[PDB]
């Protein structure tokens, strides 16, 4: 070891500046550290998990503290639709007087930032009312952060550090995570809804002091144990109801209404309590599936061994997969990241269409910001999932132990897979681009009637299937004689059909040809990003150009200029390439969402409907048109609150462009340049009194790919964030 990094002797012995850089970028890749064992691996991961949890608690505690101490929460609760919430105060000694003036808003004593995270609506909806409640929350979370640090520290000392056999007890961890972590947590949350949030929705302030005196339901507990639960659904809130008040207040604690609260435009609190209760029961009963210490349950290994189709079209089926996955933390991280990315996009798609927080659907900057936020998170999570699929194939995959099972057969016919992803991406690309360009030429030559506008009739037919009447397809739920309509008429269908056919909300928005085209661009991006990542993972162990690639690791510069040239041939390079395509795809997704909504919120839906079918329409009527207030956030005539978004807007443009350097210039140029600079320093009087301890060298090949991708991404995100927030909030509508 002998110096930083202490976990890598090969890096500490590096005399160049590289030693520092690679010490940072490799600090968490435990499997590559000197003297690593499996036990040390698992224990370091476990403790790192406690450290992460502590960070998360400390972060939420900070948000709570700042809203309570510098925010509008109490004032915001009284007028949700006319108070801009406050994130925190601004103390910047670089402000001129105009910035102090222009940023002082939200009814505060100095400059503040308006929050666009939507925590006011959430905390208001769940029952928090006073800054005092928020302080109790923040101190509780600071406490939880501390106990996270405590447990992580604890399980690193012997007799408290678990064996790897314990980490590999999968059945027990699944039983406790399904039944306890998922189920019991959800059940308790239903508790908070019926004891606190619903009372606060009906005017009752229930806290820790009085929550034992108050009943959640007048008859409660007794109809539950009798088995007559409908008494809890009996008296719901009135369709005329004021959310902080007892006007229209019911007594029901568990309903299945199906629509929105007419005032708050969000889901019914009784609906949500019922939801978490029901899925909590499903998780509880489902968490008893696997075998532990009591002589009942499943052997996941035995189930996997059993699922081998006769006739042998899947060969040996799923045999050996239990050890293949349980022994590979990268396989596990890949499955976790894939699933988590899917449900992250799912959260994004369901929180704009079915808002669950009071008075959040009217805050348009928040809905846009949250949708964008979660879609980019979901994208990065997906790319990472495939990255760890590849790392699995290199580091952990044992060909003989997976012989002729489904997993090995993935590798065995990888050229059919990759080639068909290539075909789908080429078809989608050729034709989506072709139709856009055709429409642009038609509008250039002044003949819009010559466009190719394809009705998205399949999705329209699905919306009709949901009971939307805009297209008159008369199918189930859209038709009177449908058994599906009869079966739910008495339950959720009145509220649901009411909500879907309201024209103000974002519940199954009306779609036309412009939506067809962008949906096929999105298909293109999913298919191309997926093609890059899948080819990267399946060629990680080798190709015809580099058959021994598995011997070189996940990340290496290349294999030299021989055999034709081999730059960007590693799997890590495939990830690096795919991130660009992900940023493109989520760029299309978020451009789509934000333009459709910003036209909806203005009552000018037609502008999207007519202008989204040719690309000049996107360039002129979306980006160019909505940059107007943003780019004037400061100018020769003064400033306003949008200046921080104007500045940031350029900041991104700068960072992005800086990335291009690291991506276009490659290393040797800079290495020779730095040699001339070393000569310069040694031959300059007074300065040569000063000597570097680390030999200055140009950044590594891979290191430059990473640094340039990071600048590209930071500039990407910050640019679009500045434009999104300035263009929406500037109008607030």
């Amino acid at each position: 070891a002998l110096r930083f990094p202490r976990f890598s002797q090969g890096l500490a012995q590096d005399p160049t500046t590289r030693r520092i850089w690679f010490g940072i970028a490799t600090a968490h890749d435990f499997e590559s550290h000197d003297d690593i064992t499996e036990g040390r691996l698992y224990q370091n991961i476990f403790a790192s998990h406690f450290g992460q949890l502590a960070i998360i608690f400390l972060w939420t505690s900070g948000n709570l503290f700042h809203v309570a101490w510098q925010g509008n929460f109490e004032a915001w609760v009284q007028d949700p639709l006319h108070v801009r919430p406050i994130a925190h105060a601004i103390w910047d000694p670089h402000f001129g007087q105009p910035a102090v003036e222009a940023f002082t808003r939200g009814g505060a004593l100095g400059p503040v930032n308006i929050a666009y995270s939507g925590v006011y609506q959430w905390w208001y909806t769940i029952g928090l009312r006073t800054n005092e409640d928020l302080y109790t929350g923040a101190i509780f979370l600071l406490f939880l952060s501390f106990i996270s640090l405590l447990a992580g520290w604890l399980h690193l000392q012997p007799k408290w550090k678990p064996s790897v056999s314990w980490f590999k007890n999968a059945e027990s961890r699944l039983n406790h995570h399904l039944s306890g972590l998922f189920g019991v947590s959800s059940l308790a949350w239903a508790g908070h809804l019926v004891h606190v949030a619903i009372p606060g929705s009906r005017g009752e302030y229930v806290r820790w002091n009085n929550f034992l005196s108050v009943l959640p339901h007048p008859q409660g507990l007794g109809p539950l144990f009798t088995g007559q639960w409908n008494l809890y659904a009996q008296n719901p809130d009135s369709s005329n109801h004021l959310f902080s008040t007892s006007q229209g207040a019911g007594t029901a604690i568990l309903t299945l209404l199906g629509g929105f609260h007419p005032q708050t435009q969000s889901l019914w609190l009784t609906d949500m309590a019922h939801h978490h209760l029901a899925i909590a029961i499903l998780f509880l009963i489902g968490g008893h599936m696997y075998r532990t210490n009591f002589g009942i349950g499943h052997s996941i290994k035995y189930i996997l061994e059993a699922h081998i189709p006769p006739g042998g079209r899947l060969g040996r089926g799923h045999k050996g997969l239990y050890d293949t996955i349980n022994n590979s933390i990268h396989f596990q991280l890949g499955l976790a990241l894939a699933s988590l990315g899917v449900i992250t996009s799912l959260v994004a798609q369901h929180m704009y269409s079915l808002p669950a927080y009071a008075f959040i659907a009217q805050d348009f900057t928040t809905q846009a910001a949250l949708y964008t936020h979660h879609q980019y998170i979901a994208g990065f999570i997906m790319t990472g999932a495939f990255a760890h699929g590849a790392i699995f194939f290199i580091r952990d995959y044992n060909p003989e132990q997976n012989a002729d099972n489904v997993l090995a057969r993935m590798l065995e016919h990888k050229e059919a897979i990759i080639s068909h992803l290539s075909w789908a991406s080429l078809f989608l690309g050729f034709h989506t681009l072709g139709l856009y360009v055709h429409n642009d030429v038609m509008l250039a030559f002044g003949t819009p009637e010559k466009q190719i506008l394809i009705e998205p009739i399949f999705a329209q037919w699905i919306q009709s299937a949901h009971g939307k009447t805009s297209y008159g397809f008369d199918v189930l739920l859209s038709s009177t004689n449908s058994p599906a309509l009869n079966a739910g008429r008495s339950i959720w269908l009145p509220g649901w059909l009411n909500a879907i056919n309201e024209n103000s909300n974002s519940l199954f928005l009306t779609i036309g040809p412009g939506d067809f085209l962008v949906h096929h661009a999105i298909a293109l991006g999913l298919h191309t990003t997926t093609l890059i990542l899948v080819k990267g993972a399946l060629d990680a162990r080798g190709s015809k150009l580099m058959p021994d690639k598995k011997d070189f690791g996940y990340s290496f510069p290349c294999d030299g200029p021989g055999r034709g040239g081999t730059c960007d041939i590693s799997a890590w390079d495939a990830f690096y390439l795919a991130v660009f395509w992900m940023l493109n795809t989520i760029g299309w997704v978020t451009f789509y969402w934000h333009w459709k909504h910003i036209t909806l919120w203005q009552g000018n839906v037609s502008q999207f409907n007519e202008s989204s079918t040719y690309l000049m329409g996107w360039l002129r009527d979306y980006l160019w048109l909505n940059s107007s207030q943003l780019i004037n956030g400061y100018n020769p005539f003064g400033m306003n609150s949008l200046s921080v978004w104007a500045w940031m807007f350029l900041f991104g443009h700068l960072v992005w462009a800086t990335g291009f350097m690291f991506l276009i210039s490659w290393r040797g140029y800079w290495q020779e340049l730095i040699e001339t600079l070393a000569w310069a320093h040694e031959r300059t009087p007074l300065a040569n009194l000063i000597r570097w301890r680390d030999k200055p060298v140009a950044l590594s090949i891979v290191q430059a790919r990473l640094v340039g991708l990071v600048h590209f991404s930071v500039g990407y995100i910050f640019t679009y964030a500045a434009f999104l927030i300035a263009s929406t909030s500037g109008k607030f509508g």
Partner: peptide
């Protein structure tokens, strides 16, 4: 008043101390 203490604390003093300390740890020789 408190921001006038903690903004320079974490924006000037803390980065100077952390950068100097990390510089020393990173340049050390055992």
């Amino acid at each position: 008043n408190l921001p006038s203490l903690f903004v320079p604390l974490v924006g000037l003093l803390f980065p100077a101390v952390a950068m100097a300390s990390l510089f020393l740890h990173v340049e050390k020789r055992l």
